[PDB]
C-alpha cells in the first residue's frame, strides 16, 4: 500500500498520542506537527522501521 | 504553576498547590517523598519567561 | 439570537480559550486560567457573558490568560456567613496586582 496512506495512517496514531502519552491540550498544536519532517527521513526508510517492528 | 499539570489520570500530586505563611504566602505542593535532579548549570531565561516566574 | 450569536463568534477562533454551546453542560475553559471553583454547570446567563468576557480579554485585549483570575473567593465579614463575596472575574499583572476587577451578572 502507498507509503502516503502509511504516513496518514502513523501520524493519526502519533496525533492520538500527543493527547493522553504526552497530554497535550492545544488542538492546534495537535495539528502541524508529524512524525518525521518527510524531507530529512524518507518514507521509505519508515516503511523499513514499520517492517521491522510491526 | 502548580495547576499547569495535568495527566489525564485521578493520582495526579503533582498538581495540588497551597499558600505557606512560611514562605512568601506562595504555592507549596507538600507532598513528595524525595527530589533528585541535576539542574541545568546555566539558565539564561527569555524576556518574556522571566516575567511569568515572578 | 445573540444568545447564539456569543458562541457563533467563539467558535471560529483558532485559540481556544473558552467553549459554549448552550447544550449539556458544555464549558470548559484552556486551565491555564487559574480557575478554582469548579464550572461545567451552566447555571444562568451568567457563564455565557462570562466566557465571552474571558474570550475579549484573552484574544482582541491581548492579556495573557496565565495572568486572569476567575470566580475568586474571598473571606469578607459578609452578610451571610457561607457566600464569602467571590470575585467573578480579574485581571492580574505579572506581580500579582488585580488591574480589571470585574462583576459579570447576567
Do not use: C
Amino acid at each position: 500500500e502507498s507509503p502516503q496512506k502509511l504516513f496518514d495512517r502513523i501520524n493519526a496514531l502519533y496525533k492520538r498520542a500527543l493527547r493522553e502519552q504526552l497530554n497535550v491540550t492545544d488542538e492546534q498544536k495537535i495539528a502541524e506537527d508529524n512524525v518525521i519532517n518527510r524531507n530529512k527521513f524518507p518514507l521509505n526508510k519508515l516503511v523499513y522501521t514499520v517492517q521491522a517492528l510491526e | 504553576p502548580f495547576r499547569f499539570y495535568v495527566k489525564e489520570t485521578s493520582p495526579n500530586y503533582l498538581e495540588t498547590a497551597s499558600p505557606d505563611a512560611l514562605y512568601g504566602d506562595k504555592e507549596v505542593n507538600g507532598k513528595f517523598d524525595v527530589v533528585v535532579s541535576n539542574p541545568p548549570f546555566s539558565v539564561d531565561l527569555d524576556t518574556q519567561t522571566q516575567r511569568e516566574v515572578r | 439570537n445573540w444568545q447564539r450569536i456569543v458562541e457563533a463568534k467563539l467558535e471560529q477562533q483558532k485559540h481556544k480559550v473558552a467553549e459554549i454551546s448552550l447544550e449539556n453542560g458544555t464549558v470548559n475553559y484552556s486551565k491555564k486560567i487559574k480557575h478554582n471553583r469548579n464550572l461545567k454547570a451552566l447555571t444562568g446567563d451568567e457563564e455565557i457573558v462570562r466566557a465571552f468576557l474571558i474570550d475579549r480579554l484573552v484574544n482582541e485585549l491581548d492579556y495573557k490568560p496565565e495572568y486572569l483570575e476567575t470566580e475568586k473567593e474571598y473571606t469578607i465579614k459578609g452578610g451571610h456567613s457561607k457566600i464569602n463575596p467571590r470575585v467573578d472575574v480579574l485581571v492580574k499583572d505579572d506581580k500579582g496586582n488585580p488591574f480589571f476587577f470585574i462583576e459579570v451578572k447576567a
